[PDB]
Amino acid sequence: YTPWLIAGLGNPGNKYYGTRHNVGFEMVDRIAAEEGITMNTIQSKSLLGIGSIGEVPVLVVKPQSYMNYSGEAIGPLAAYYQVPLRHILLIYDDTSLPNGVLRLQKKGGHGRHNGLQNVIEHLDGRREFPRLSIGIGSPPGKMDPRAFLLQKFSSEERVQIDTALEQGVDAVRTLVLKGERFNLVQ
């Protein structure tokens, strides 16, 4: 019964709600909902909830440190709860995949994602932790990349992101229960 730490990346506060760079928060909210977990514990610069998926104990976490300091929140939690590297699941927006497309990896660099970069660093530079990328595509035309992250999804994008969240819940449960690459199919 080794636990998992399921962390979704984002920025804290009302201003960020619904923004592309917060989609990891949406996924974890959805997982938490599906597994009957309430995210009301304040600890290590985060909001978190403790529960289980099947017989596996997990913690679901939304760091409230700002995206750039995500590792500051996650490292200490993994230490506190004795979560091994391999069970630290990061969920986040990935501009290298089309909107709404999910991908699961068991290791990898940060793809210049500031939050993922900070997690890796706070994990002693280790990269062998699983990730669920949530595609958001690139910024249209010349729109500023930063601005793009910090804007809400379009009406059309939204429908695809919703579909992805439903798909995500099941992929994460399966990853966590199953105890080498994996493809996802919706």
Domain residue ranges in the chain: 1-186
CA dihedral sign, ordered 173, 177, 179, 185: negative
- The annotation status of 16 as a binding-site residue, yes or no, is yes
Length of the chain (residues): 186
> Which residues, at least 6 apart from 160, have a Cβ–Cβ distance to it below 8 Å?
99, 100
Q: Which 3 state secondary structure label does DSSP give 176?
A: helix
| Spatial distance between the Cα atoms of 60 and 39, rounded to a whole number of angstroms | 7
Enter the DSSP assignment of 149.
H
- The annotation status of 114 as a binding-site residue, yes or no, is yes
Q: Are 144 and 95 in contact (CB under 8 A)?
A: no
- The annotation status of 80 as a binding-site residue, yes or no, is no
Pick the CATH number of 1-186 from 3.30.70.20, 3.40.50.1470, 3.50.50.60, 3.20.20.70: 3.40.50.1470
User: Which are the catalytic amino acids?
Assistant: 21
| Spatial distance between the Cα atoms of 106 and 117, rounded to a whole number of angstroms | 15
| Spatial distance between the Cα atoms of 35 and 183, rounded to a whole number of angstroms | 23
Task: Number of helices (H) and strands (E) in the chain: give both, helices first.
Answer: 5, 7
| Spatial distance between the Cα atoms of 70 and 88, rounded to a whole number of angstroms | 13
